């Protein structure tokens, strides 16, 4: 898959969520946003 070797901000996270809502669906997209939520809270 794509590696994303750069610094992450809000617009790039929105791009990743909008890309995950193209080939996976609603529930996998919500699960990805949940994992990114807990990762951002932890760090």
């Amino acid at each position: 898959m794509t590696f994303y070797n750069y610094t992450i901000d809000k617009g790039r996270l929105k791009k990743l969520i909008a890309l995950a809502y193209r080939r996976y669906g609603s529930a996998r997209c919500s699960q990805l946003a949940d994992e990114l939520k807990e990762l951002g809270f932890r760090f």
Partner: protein, 125 residues
């Protein structure tokens, strides 16, 4: 109108709580009976003419208060609610009781943050 749509209930304390439609119907009936009394006993035409004008102003205040002439007021100079006033505004029948209602099986509380809790899940007290 039916009497249960213009209710007259009693409060704890002995005072009765009335609706404004009863005063308007009472004015209409009072002026109608006085007009029949004046036409029965052959009153002069300046008295029967003022009684018909007053009945005319009484029917207009029951339908639409303050549309043509002076607004009929109540106890603290508050205008009486009429048959078009109970339906015509944002506090009327359409916007307060038909397009939006108060519902059963409902509640409310303040909200707090819910981390270590999934999406599609709410914490219900």
């Amino acid at each position: 109108i039916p009497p249960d749509l213009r209710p007259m209930v009693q409060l704890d304390g002995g005072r009765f709580a009335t609706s404004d439609l009863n005063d308007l119907y009472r004015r209409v009936i009072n002026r109608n009976n006085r007009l029949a009394r004046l036409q029965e006993i052959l009153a002069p035409e300046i008295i029967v003419r003022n009684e018909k004008r007053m009945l005319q102003e009484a029917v207009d205040a029951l339908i639409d208060n303050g549309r043509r002439g002076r607004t009929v007021v109540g106890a603290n100079n508050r205008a009486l609610k009429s048959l078009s006033d109970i339906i015509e505004g944002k506090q009327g029948r359409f916007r307060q009781n038909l397009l939006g209602k108060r519902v059963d099986y409902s509640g409310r509380s303040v909200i707090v943050v819910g981390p270590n809790l999934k999406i599609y899940q709410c914490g219900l007290p």
